[PDB]
A and B are shown apart, each in its own frame.
Chain A
Amino acid sequence: ALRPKTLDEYIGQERLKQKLRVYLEAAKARKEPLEHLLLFGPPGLGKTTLAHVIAHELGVNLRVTSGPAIEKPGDLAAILANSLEEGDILFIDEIHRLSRQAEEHLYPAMEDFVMDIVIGQGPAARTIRLELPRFTLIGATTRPGLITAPLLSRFGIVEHLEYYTPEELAQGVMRDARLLGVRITEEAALEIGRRSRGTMRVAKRLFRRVRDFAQVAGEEVITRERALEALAALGLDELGLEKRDREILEVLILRFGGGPVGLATLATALSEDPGTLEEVHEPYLIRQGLLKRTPRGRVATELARRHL
C-alpha cells in the first residue's frame, strides 16, 4: 500500500524540519547534494519512509541498505558505482554497525562523490579512484550513543528523532482508517494511539494481525467500544504492555520481587535473549513508570505490581 510521497503528507514533528526543511530548500538554492543526514532516536519512529519520501520531493529514486548487510568491502562501492542518476538517495540503516574499514571507504563519497581504493602488496603502490555520482546519504542509527565513530564528522547534519505523541500517531491511524473495508472512530482510535508507544511501527501492528481473525470480521466496525474492547480483550493487552510484558514483570515481580536482578539472570529466567530483553522489551517498560535499570540490576517500580 504505497503512499503519495510528500512532506505536507508527513505526520510528525516540526523541529528537525525547522533545520532540515530549510536545507531541503537548499537543494534548490545551490544544487542536488543535501548534506549527509544521520538519524537518531528509538526505532519505529519513522526513518525510511521519511526520505523514502524525501526523494520524490527532490527528483531522484532511493536506494536503501542496512549497515551489517555489508560483507564485501566493495558492496557499497557497487551501491555507489552506477545505479544512481545524479541525485538518488542512499539510505544506510543500522549504519553504526559497519565493517571496521567498510565505514572508512565511505568518507570519499562525503567531500563530493569519490571512492579512492588504497592498494598495494609490498611495498604498497598507488591508489585507485572511481567516479561515484553526486548523491544524498541517509545513515540512521537505532542506538547512536557512542557507536557512530568519528564518521559523525563526514556526515552533514545530525538531527534527533523521538516519539510521536498519542495524538500524532492516533492521527495517522485515522488516515489509516481508509484502507480496505473498515471504519474506525477518533476518540476510539485515540485508544490505539497510546498503545503504540510513540511509534508508527507499533501503531499498526495491532490491526495488521487483526485482519485474519474470526470474531472481528463480523463486527468489522470499530468505535471506542471495540477500540478498547478487542484491544483489552483478545488484542491481548491493556495499556500497551502486552502478554510477554506482563509475563516479564510477573517474573520480575513474582519470582524475584520488586528487587533488582540483572539482565544476566532474568533474561534466562524469562528464557530469553538477554540482548533481546533489554533491547526489545525492557524499552517501553522503562519509558512508562514500570521498569527501572539499576546498577544492582533491573527492578519493578511500584506502579507495576499494583498495575498487575
Chain B
Amino acid sequence: MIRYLRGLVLKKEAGGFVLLAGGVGFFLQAPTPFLQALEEGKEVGVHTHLLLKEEGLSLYGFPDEENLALFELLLSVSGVGPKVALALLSALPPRLLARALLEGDARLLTSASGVGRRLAERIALELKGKVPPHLLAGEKVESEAAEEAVMALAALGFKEAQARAVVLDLLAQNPKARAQDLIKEALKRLR
C-alpha cells in the first residue's frame, strides 16, 4: 500500500533508518549502498515496500523504482525473504542484478553477501526469463529533446524562436518526438 514517502532522515543505522514524513517517524530497512548515500537531516524520497507479518509490520526502502522492483520481484521467489533480497540488492548493482536474474547467474548471485549456494540457484532457475520489461538499464532521460531540437535548429541558421516556436507546435500535434524526428520535421515547416 505504502510505496512512496517524503521526510527527514531523522536517524540512520546499520541496515535501517528513520523517515519523519508527516509527524510519524517511520522505520525502514534499506540496502547498504542506498543506506550509506543517506544523510540525517536532509529531505528524501523513498520507494517503500510495506510488509505484514505475525508480530508487526515492516518497511523496506529503496533508492529508485528500479531497485524496489527487484526487491519485490526478488521476494516473489519462494524462500527468498527481505533479508536476502536486500543482500542481493545491497551487493551487486541493480542493472547487473537484473541481467543476472534474467539469465540465471546462480554463480554470480552466490557471489554476494548472504551468498546462497543452492538458494542463489533456486532464485535463479526460478526467475530465469520471468524478469523484466524496462529493467535492464536504470531509466534516465537525457536532455529536453524539445529544446535540444531548437538548440540544433538555432546552430543550423534559423533564429532561435522561429525554431522553438514551431518545435512546440510540433510536440503539440505530436507529443512523441525524438529531437531527431522532431528537428527534421522542423526543417520541413521551416523551408
Which A residues are within 8 Å of any B CB, using their own CB? 71-75, 77-78, 81-82, 117-119, 125-126, 128-131
B187 CB–A CB distance under 8 Å: yes
Contact of A73 among B148, B157, B179, B184 (CB under 8 A): B157
B112 CB–A CB distance under 8 Å: no
Chain A residues, Cβ within 8 Å of B190:
78
- CB-CB nearest in chain B for A83: B188
Among B38-86, those with CB < 8 Å from A are: none
Contact of A74 among B143, B148, B158, B180 (CB under 8 A): B158
CA–CA, A75 and B157, complex, Å:
9
Shortest C-beta distance, B3 to chain A (Å), equals 35
Chain A residues, Cβ within 8 Å of B188:
78, 82
Query: Are A119 and B187 closer than 8 Å at their CB atoms?
Result: no
- CB-CB nearest in chain A for B187: A78
Task: With A78-B187, A78-B188, A82-B188 as known contacts, state yes or no: A117 contacts B180, CB within 8 Å.
Answer: no
Query: Are B153 and A74 closer than 8 Å at their CB atoms?
Result: yes
B161 CB–A CB distance under 8 Å: no
Query: Are A131 and B155 closer than 8 Å at their CB atoms?
Result: no
Query: Are B156 and A72 closer than 8 Å at their CB atoms?
Result: yes
Query: Are A128 and B187 closer than 8 Å at their CB atoms?
Result: no
SS class, residues of chain A in contact with chain B: loop
Interface residues of B, CB < 8 Å — how many?
18
Query: Are A74 and B187 closer than 8 Å at their CB atoms?
Result: yes
Task: With A78-B188, A82-B184, A130-B184 as known contacts, state yes or no: A119 contacts B155, CB within 8 Å.
Answer: yes
Shortest C-beta distance, A145 to chain B (Å), equals 29
Chain A residues, Cβ within 8 Å of B155:
73, 117-119
CA–CA, A128 and B179, complex, Å:
9
CA–CA, A81 and B151, complex, Å:
17
10 CB contacts below 8 A, A to B, read: A72-B157, A74-B153, A74-B156, A75-B157, A78-B187, A119-B151, A128-B179, A129-B180, A130-B180, A131-B180
Chain A residues, Cβ within 8 Å of B156:
72-74, 77, 117
Task: With A77-B187, A78-B187 as known contacts, state yes or no: A117 contacts B152, CB within 8 Å.
Answer: yes
B191 CB–A CB distance under 8 Å: yes
Query: Are B184 and A119 closer than 8 Å at their CB atoms?
Result: no
Shortest C-beta distance, A122 to chain B (Å), equals 13
Further 10 A-B residue pairs, CB within 8 A, beyond A72-B156, A82-B188: A73-B155, A73-B156, A74-B156, A74-B157, A78-B191, A118-B155, A119-B151, A126-B143, A128-B183, A130-B180
Chain A residues, Cβ within 8 Å of B187:
74, 77-78, 81
Chain B residues, Cβ within 8 Å of A126:
143
Chain A residues, Cβ within 8 Å of B180:
129-131
Shortest C-beta distance, B47 to chain A (Å), equals 30
Query: Are B191 and A130 closer than 8 Å at their CB atoms?
Result: no
**Which has the most chain A C-beta neighbours within 10 Å: B153, B184, B191?**
B184
Question: What 6 pairs between A and B have smallest CB-CB spacing?
Answer: A74-B156, A72-B157, A78-B187, A81-B184, A128-B152, A117-B152
CA–CA, A82 and B188, complex, Å:
9
- CB-CB nearest in chain A for B181: A131
Among B126-166, those with CB < 8 Å from A are: 143, 148, 151-153, 155-158
CA–CA, A129 and B156, complex, Å:
13
CA–CA, A119 and B157, complex, Å:
12
CA–CA, A71 and B190, complex, Å:
13
Shortest C-beta distance, B183 to chain A (Å), equals 7
Query: Are A128 and B148 closer than 8 Å at their CB atoms?
Result: yes
**Which has the most chain B C-beta neighbours within 10 Å: A73, A74, A78, A125?**
A74
Query: Are B183 and A130 closer than 8 Å at their CB atoms?
Result: yes
CA–CA, A125 and B155, complex, Å:
13
